[PDB]
Amino acid sequence: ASVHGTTYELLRRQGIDTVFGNPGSNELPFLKDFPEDFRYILALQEACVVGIADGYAQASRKPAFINLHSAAGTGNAMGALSNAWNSHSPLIVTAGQQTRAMIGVEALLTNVDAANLPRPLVKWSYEPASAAEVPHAMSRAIHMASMAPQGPVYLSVPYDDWDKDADPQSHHLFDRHVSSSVRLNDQDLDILVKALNSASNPAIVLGPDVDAANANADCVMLAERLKAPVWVAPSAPRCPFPTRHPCFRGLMPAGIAAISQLLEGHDVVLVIGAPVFRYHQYDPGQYLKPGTRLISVTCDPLEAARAPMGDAIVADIGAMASALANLVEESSRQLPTAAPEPAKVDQDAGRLHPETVFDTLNDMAPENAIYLNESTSTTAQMWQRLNMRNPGSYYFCAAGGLGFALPAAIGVQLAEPERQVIAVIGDGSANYSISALWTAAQYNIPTIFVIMNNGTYGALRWFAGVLEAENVPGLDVPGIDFRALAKGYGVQALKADNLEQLKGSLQEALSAKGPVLIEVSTVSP
């Protein structure tokens, strides 16, 4: 067998059947004779290839396979990798290298010091020392991406390797099962359960690894038994809990003093599937107030090490959430009462308030919609206004890197063909991976893109206000016609300048048989 044949066999035996790619000449020997059972998803720029794969992985809860072109293709994707690192996305990134005979002279398209290029944003990064090693290296990549804590990995392959003879002993790679589905030993688990049972005012804080694990329903059982309020950890990249459940208390503010104040009076705070914590703004104070202690369950030793307070347990989030939900006592305390509905903001017949857009989306979208956020100044309102009952219903760029939601919405919709994906993207963010629109058009992946157009980088105007920073250049982005960009890439486009047109545009988009972009004229900050 050739290295090509053995590698595609390994991939299909490990569950991989799709290649997200932008091709190049170092990759033609890999892509030729492309197997009939695989499907290649082209995108026009690498940040878009990786963003699509990333949404697909996160929504499918399985690794996604990427193929990029040498150094420049890999480099074009590094902002996307920054997000994938922070979301623990299982991404297997492969890039073609020059033929081994041309690497020394550094011929054009040589990826110099290849394994160092994607660092520090990958779990494992490698170039094999011979062609026969490529299937074993690919095996290592699959498992490194897929073990807890999941994350992106990188394999560089000289293009001459593919046609070489494979090692016949590579067949032992094909059916390897590797598990990291582990939980705290019985004795220590019992100590943890007794501490939860004994708490007089417990709180729960949930992060994105809960949704990744599909542990959401176990965490609802846990919060119901403990009769405990549930917050989402700050800077949330996913939604880990039904947002209209009576226990739900919303997104935590990403500040040190805000969070200790929020948690005051809670004696035991249990954090599951989040870093402790992904703060953002400068908000100095106590990490925790007197009387509050914290216990974190994380799948990631780097999170456990860097928490400034609390105990920690490094284990699988699905296994831990399930064990705790089934072991804790039913508390005799009263179940928390549901937060009230948000108020309607006054809206005239002109530009839309973001509140109005979310309220209308919530009124019209199916109950199993999936939302993506890259509307940076409207996050708090989005979280208050969208009822998200099901898992896998929210994604926001986990490292803050814009250019995620537009491609990732396409990957998510590919992963979940029966759930309507709606990406709400600011006019600033929409440009970073605008070319991804073409993939949705070409493959007919029926994502709806809602572009919030207020003409400015609104969140940066807000941070500038907090800093009291005057005379900052580069904050305005006038003069973009999103309907013309959608036409550019083959996607039906609509404009909503007021509420009547927003309703009509949403009705048409929800009825459409393909992707749709709606440019919404929003109020300027």
Ligand X SMILES: Cc1ncc(C[n+]2c([C@@H](O)/C=C/c3cccnc3)sc(CCOP(=O)(O)OP(=O)(O)O)c2C)c(N)n1
Footprint (CB under 8 A) of a copy of itself, residues 21-80: 21-25, 28-29, 31-34, 40, 42, 44-47, 70-80
> Shortest approach of a copy of itself to residue 333 CB, angstroms?
27
Helix (H) or strand (E) holding 136: helix 134-146
Candidate list 4, 9, 21, 27, residue with the active-site label: 27
> Shortest approach of a copy of itself to residue 98 CB, angstroms?
9
> Would you say 79 or 240 has its CB closer to ligand X?
79
> Shortest approach of a copy of itself to residue 225 CB, angstroms?
19
> Would you say 217 or 523 has its CB closer to Mg ion?
523
Annotated catalytic residue 400:
yes
Q: Is 117 annotated for ligand binding?
A: yes
Q: Which residues pair with 518 in a beta bridge?
A: 450, 494
Q: Does 347 bind ligand X (CB under 6 A)?
A: no
Q: Which two tokens stand for residue 413?
A: 């919709």
Length of the chain: 525
Which of 336, 304, 389, 309 has the alpha carbon at shortest distance from 202?
336
> Would you say 91 or 406 has its CB closer to ligand X?
406
Q: Which two tokens stand for residue 298?
A: 């994380």
Using CB under 8 A as the binding rule, the residues of this chain from 177 to 236 that contact a copy of itself are 177-185, 188, 234-235
**Residues 204 and 272 sit within 8 Å (Cβ to Cβ):** yes
Q: Does 426 bind Mg ion (CB under 5 A)?
A: yes
Which of 90, 128, 208, 391 binds a copy of itself (CB under 8 A)? It is 128
Instruction: Round to whole Å and give the CA distance between 217 and 209.
Output: 13
Q: What is the DSSP letter of 523?
A: P
Q: Site for Mg ion (CB under 5 A): how many residues?
A: 5
**Residues 500 and 347 sit within 8 Å (Cβ to Cβ):** no
Q: Which two tokens stand for residue 337?
A: 């009462």
Q: Does 237 bind ligand X (CB under 6 A)?
A: no
Q: Is 376 annotated for ligand binding?
A: no
Instruction: Round to whole Å and give the CA distance between 356 and 300.
Output: 39
Instruction: Round to whole Å and give the CA distance between 344 and 477.
Output: 29
**Residues 176 and 243 sit within 8 Å (Cβ to Cβ):** no
Q: Which two tokens stand for residue 111?
A: 């990826």
> Shortest approach of a copy of itself to residue 471 CB, angstroms?
5
Q: Does 410 bind a copy of itself (CB under 8 A)?
A: no
Annotated catalytic residue 69:
yes
> Shortest approach of Mg ion to residue 426 CB, angstroms?
4
Q: Does 273 bind ligand X (CB under 6 A)?
A: no
Annotated catalytic residue 171:
no
Instruction: Round to whole Å and give the CA distance between 271 and 333.
Output: 21
Q: Which residues of 90-101 are buried (b: 16+ CB within 10 A; e: fewer)?
A: bbbbbbbbbbee
Which of 393, 395, 387, 389 has the alpha carbon at shortest distance from 359?
387
Q: Does 78 bind ligand X (CB under 6 A)?
A: no
Which of 93, 252, 397, 423 binds a copy of itself (CB under 8 A)? It is 397
> Shortest approach of ligand X to residue 460 CB, angstroms?
5
Q: Does 121 bind ligand X (CB under 6 A)?
A: no
Annotated catalytic residue 25:
yes
Candidate list 15, 181, 280, 367, residue with the active-site label: 280
Which of 123, 116, 11 has the alpha carbon at shortest distance from 74?
116
Which of 264, 311, 330, 341 binds a copy of itself (CB under 8 A)? It is 311
Q: Mark 2-41 with x for binding to ligand X (rule: CB under 6 A) and - for no binding.
A: --------------------xxxx----------------
**Residues 316 and 299 sit within 8 Å (Cβ to Cβ):** yes
Instruction: Round to whole Å and give the CA distance between 313 and 272.
Output: 10
> Would you say 110 or 146 has its CB closer to ligand X?
110
Q: Which residues contact 38 (CB under 8 A, 6 or more apart)?
A: 8, 11, 12, 17, 18, 19
Using CB under 6 A as the binding rule, the residues of this chain from 415 to 454 that contact ligand X are 426-429, 432, 454
> Would you say 54 or 374 has its CB closer to ligand X?
374
Q: Is 498 annotated for ligand binding?
A: no
Instruction: Round to whole Å and give the CA distance between 214 and 376.
Output: 26
Annotated catalytic residue 151:
no
Annotated binding site: 116-117, 119, 427, 454, 456
Annotated binding site for Mg(2+): 116-117, 119
Annotated binding site for Ca(2+): 427, 454, 456
